[PDB]
Amino acid sequence: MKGDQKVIEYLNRGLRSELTAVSQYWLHYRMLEDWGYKDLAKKWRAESIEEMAHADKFVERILFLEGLPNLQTLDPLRIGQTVKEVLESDLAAEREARALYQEGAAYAASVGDFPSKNLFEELMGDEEHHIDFLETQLDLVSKLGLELYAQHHIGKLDD
Amino acid sequence: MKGDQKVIEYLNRGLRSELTAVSQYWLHYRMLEDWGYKDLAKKWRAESIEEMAHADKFVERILFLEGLPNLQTLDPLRIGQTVKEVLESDLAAEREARALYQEGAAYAASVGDFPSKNLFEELMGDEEHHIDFLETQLDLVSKLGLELYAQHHIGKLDD
Amino acid sequence: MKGDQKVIEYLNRGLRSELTAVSQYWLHYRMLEDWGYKDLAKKWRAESIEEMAHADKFVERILFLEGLPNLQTLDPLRIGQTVKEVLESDLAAEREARALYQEGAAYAASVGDFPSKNLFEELMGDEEHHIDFLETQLDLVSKLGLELYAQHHIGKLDD
Amino acid sequence: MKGDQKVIEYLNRGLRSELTAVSQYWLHYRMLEDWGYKDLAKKWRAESIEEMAHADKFVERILFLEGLPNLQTLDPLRIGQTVKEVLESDLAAEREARALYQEGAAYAASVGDFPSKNLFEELMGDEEHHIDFLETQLDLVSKLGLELYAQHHIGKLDD
């Protein structure tokens, strides 16, 4: 069904934002695993896979509106080199994603494309829940110090 | 463990190659679904997920060798606009991936990095199996014509 | 609870639109079965029953707002006499339904009747998914020809 | 138990005929798989394995009669390069096998070796059932054309 061009442009911007998050969180998952924080690595793997589902929803909506999904490029990755930098890098990215979806939802609403608007609002609520998770981890790091926070999430040793 | 820099560079080249395949095949999956060939869409989804596991293997080996995995960029995507063009696009990409892994394996072998060499040779055998699959689909299209080939894989209607 | 008169008028227009779809798709289901396309008949039966649930949601919301649901009349039915005409007839109807719900949602939003607005937006997303299904069937008919498309969905013979 | 020399010669001719069929049908199975006709490849694999059991019955009967089974050589293989040539090649081979078993059964009957006669007659009935299968596939190819016949047996894509 032919969609509004500008809504499709917002969908493609959101697709790029998710593709960035998928790779940033996957590499952070593998970094946390390499540093030994297996329980943080678990959660980051799961979070990357949630971003993969978001990416796929934008691909599907762009095609239905007869647009061309563009997976060629990512936004710049922010890669942390301590557990606190990983938290701060992902928080920054998620704040940008939330602001993009807020704008995409408002634009879609303005042209009557209510299903695209509900897609952006659903994604904006999901990224606010991830923001809430990341802010809570940074709150623990500030109250306990980074070492006590990270040590609690080393996890169990593999059989 | 500090790795050979040039093996790490081959690993990062392979990581980019897999990231490209993941997105090329995922978009092709969603295209085949949008066109209505649900049985080809199923297989392409599964193939993209196999490429995601390959990508993750390169990330893990790069970090173990104390390199920096680079997920920022992809090789150029080849996007097909008919079922035959999707087959041809993916075959071309997999041929490049196979040659890169052949080279990577021989290079690692030359510096005694036998685990990295075995990672490349395992991936090169997996990409040859995908090349086998794609050449067989193209063989069917040449013997039956594209319409008879595609129509067999429309699949079932969703409940 | 006394509702906005004009929102109730949009709900009653939507009820008529669904009642039309229920009968158009049921008769098309029975036509596809009589022509022998049992797998298309299955999907059309299911689609008619999904429209019956939509009809019932408008009846329930109209009564809660103390309006009088009017089931006396349908919009004009569009009845196809080939598999391609069935697809085109249902697509045309669904485009009109989607535009009505877009308008109903915007009107309800303008008077603060957010539950009626969410009902129209939920229905507008559901009819866009049916539009997507119908457009995909027409895409197959254009790429393969009507005979190859229909033959794939003849289905199995009854015991 | 010492058998009739000439019956043992017919058993050894039958062993060679089965060993030929085993390899002809196995290579055709793998050819049909490489061309993409997975449901024809399935049936040819099974047919080759049925010929393997026939081969083994001749080995066992030759030893019991104190002869020397000769597995060194095959009859000339007939290898098809299209689905129709595969059908015609196997049909030709099976006609020759049936005529050999007819003759072997009659010869064994003439010398009172009724168990060897029943072995040849059992095998001759089994090869007539395969002849019936192959002739039916060629009947479909002549009534529908090779493309419609082969396309129906492409099968499902591997997980």
Added chain:
Amino acid sequence: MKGDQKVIEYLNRGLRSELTAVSQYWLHYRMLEDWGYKDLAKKWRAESIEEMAHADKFVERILFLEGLPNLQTLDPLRIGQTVKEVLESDLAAEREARALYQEGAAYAASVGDFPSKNLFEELMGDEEHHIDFLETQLDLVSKLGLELYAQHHIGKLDD
């Protein structure tokens, strides 16, 4: 995918070598059964079936590389007329098969055909395990004498 011609020639040599082993061991299985050593007959049947899987692996790789598998001929069969001669015959054949796969692996490695090299090296390790088995049986025959060795493996009488 077009393969190196000389690797395809090594693959076809290996195919002939396996076809020879399948028939040598199947006939030896049936000989051991006819002589009454049912436990040696069981193992030889199982070993012949392992060789059948090896044969099939060469057929599949030859077709993938667009070569023509040749099942027409076998290498000369070595048929033993005592349990010790069966052991010696099969050991001699497996030594030749091992040397052929060693050569085939080194050749494929030299042209970068790493999947074919891994197929040869996998087969060469499997034939070394069979060489280990056969040398162990010959060791028992030399330490205990052939009659004590063979008598232990008569097995049970059929119901």
Added chain:
Amino acid sequence: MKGDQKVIEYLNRGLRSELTAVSQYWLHYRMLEDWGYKDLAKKWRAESIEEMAHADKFVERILFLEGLPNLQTLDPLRIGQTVKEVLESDLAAEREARALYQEGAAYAASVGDFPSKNLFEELMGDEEHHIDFLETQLDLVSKLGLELYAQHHIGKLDD
């Protein structure tokens, strides 16, 4: 149904031959048990019971053809006084039974009594399988010596 007199005479000769085998093998079963070869005793018990079923088939066919089955007399029993004599005695008897059934089958075939002919041919195949078993036991005795052969079949001691 009135049968051919001479076919009934062959059936009655076969009945006497089976009744002889039943008692010869039962007494040999009990002799092998008394000597201690419990696993040979098991097989001989089972073989006697297979001969009992053969005897019963001749009784049933003779009555259906309105003849008088004669169970009054046996052929002379051959009773072995070592394990090798038991094998040789039963082999001699079974060779005579096989020759009788060969002749009975040919005679019945000559008068069109195809069901009696198939009964004799079925029995002739079954006695050839017993001949094969007995010859194999004598082959073991000649290759290993009687003591090693018999000792392997002493069996387990009763609880």
Added chain:
Amino acid sequence: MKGDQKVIEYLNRGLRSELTAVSQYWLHYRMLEDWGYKDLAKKWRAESIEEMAHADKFVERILFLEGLPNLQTLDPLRIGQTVKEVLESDLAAEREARALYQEGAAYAASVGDFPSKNLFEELMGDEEHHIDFLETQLDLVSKLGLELYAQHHIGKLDD
């Protein structure tokens, strides 16, 4: 596969003989049920259904030999008007069927059509077993009188 014309003529005569038996025994089944002999009605129903399988085997063999099965006509039916006449009528028919299959088997054997010969011989053994059943029922009627024989097979009353 083109069969011998005269064997196909014997197969078509056998098809007519079975089609006669199917209807004669079905009507006798329903007559015995109407007279009240429910246990004889059960057996006759089952016997008719066994004749239906025989009929189908002749249809299948005639088509495989590229003949034209003729189901248009039956041999004259013999319908009994007492339980003893039913037994005598079916016995007469079965004697004629047995003689036909004897002749068909001998003719097929004479032209080497061993699978058709085995079909006739299998059917001739099956009709001899039915002859045996019918003769036994007439033996009971002669020893006990028709009333005691029939009364024992009245059966149970329907719920």
Added chain:
Amino acid sequence: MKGDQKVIEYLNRGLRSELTAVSQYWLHYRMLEDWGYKDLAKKWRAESIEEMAHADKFVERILFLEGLPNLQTLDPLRIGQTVKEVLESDLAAEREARALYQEGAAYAASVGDFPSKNLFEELMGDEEHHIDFLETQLDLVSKLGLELYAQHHIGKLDD
């Protein structure tokens, strides 16, 4: 099968290396348990048992190649007297084992002993995974301090 003497010498060197690791890690397991770090003791027990399987693989390959496995001596043990020293001691040993297997694999490859080369390369990849584990523990000790790292792995108290 007679092996290359120098490959057998590399195998015996590897056997000594594994015997050393088995005892170093078993004693470290029992030390960690005595100090109270029950979760580190669990993993070290499991790692020592993995080294026992490696040792056994060298024994088996040495005997197959007709060499004499030498279990008499170990390389010098490095025993740690703090949790950090145990990590450092085991890392140093595994680095030596990895270099030995790299050398052994390259040497075997040079003489065509591909099964022994694959044994060394498999072991070299397993020791690299253990090196990865030990480097990660040392990374945690450097980022958190030894007391926080060790305290997380005290484990549970025994019932």
Added chain:
Amino acid sequence: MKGDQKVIEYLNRGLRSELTAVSQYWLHYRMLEDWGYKDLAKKWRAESIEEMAHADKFVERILFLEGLPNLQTLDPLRIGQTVKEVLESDLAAEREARALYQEGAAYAASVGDFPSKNLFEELMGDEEHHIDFLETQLDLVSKLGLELYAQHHIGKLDD
């Protein structure tokens, strides 16, 4: 808890004696397997694993008494080159182990270290049971001859 120095010296001598037995019996297990005596190989594997548990008990008791377990060295290994030499070599070793534990138990008793005394006495009873097993195998070899003894324990062939 600080132990008696001399008791710890006896514990460390016992640890060396067990470490010797573990490797002597493991290599003998693998030798018996390579010679083909699979049922003797099974028992020797199990016996080596029982010695591994003894070794571990000495490690644990030495640490609890604040001594330093020494795993660096073994006593000289005695490696047999026939089944009888394997039995005699292990018997000699076990006699030395039993005498050591007798002495260790008496010494520990003399200094009141009753738990170490009970450890030595438990181990001395376990090694007497192994002495009993080994002497019984040598008794069989002397009464039956080595060939009949070893042949009974060849075992079953691997699937």
Added chain:
Amino acid sequence: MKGDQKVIEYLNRGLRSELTAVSQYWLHYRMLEDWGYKDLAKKWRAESIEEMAHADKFVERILFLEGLPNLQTLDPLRIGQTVKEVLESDLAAEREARALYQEGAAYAASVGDFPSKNLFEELMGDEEHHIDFLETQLDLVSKLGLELYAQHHIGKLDD
């Protein structure tokens, strides 16, 4: 049975020592629970209940020897007011208990009362295992500091 008076006196001293341990460890269990270290409280409860079984064994042995068990008095309790004092208090008590059982065992042995001697030696081994546990907890407190040690054993909060 009348026992040795002095052995009964040692049994009664041991009964008093166990009764002291039961109450010291039960009160420490309840103290650790009141301070919040639920996982240390669990282990101390279990340890007190193990001491209750020891107490009961002395009661039973004293009565069998016709002595009078005296439960009226305890040795002085040592009650800790920090987690480290609890560990040190219980360690001191257990050292005294171990020395008493060592002496009781030696005395009983001197008068031939071997069952009482084995009771004391069994108890002395059990108290050495508790000494080992307590020393390990104090080792953790010295390596990690009391706070990190105790915090790891706070446990879970009650539902």
Added chain:
Amino acid sequence: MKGDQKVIEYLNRGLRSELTAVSQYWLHYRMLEDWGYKDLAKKWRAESIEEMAHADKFVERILFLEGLPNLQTLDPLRIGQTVKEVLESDLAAEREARALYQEGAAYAASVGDFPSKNLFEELMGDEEHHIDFLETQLDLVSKLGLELYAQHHIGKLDD
């Protein structure tokens, strides 16, 4: 293994003592059953069977030490003619057995035969438990009188 002669003499004295107890308690079991005290008969049967296991342990230890177990003779039996005499007779025997095992254990300990010493001490503890049972029954008889004691153990009547 050659044992100490005098320890073997003590083992043989213990074997005689157990063989006496087995028969004394079995006859008392059967006497108590004949008098009607079925619950005392149950316990005496079980006690005799416990003595049978003791007897067997002495047989096994005597043979392992290469002595000759002597089962030819018993010590004099003490057979009671009232329930109280049965208790007193068995108590007297068990006191003698306990004193013998005390002496045997001390002697074995003096020559370092610690496994024989532990066998005697285990048996001495088991006979003290039986002494305890018998003394308790005599205590009941003295406190309640023989009639009330015996009547409580008459038991239930057999079905």
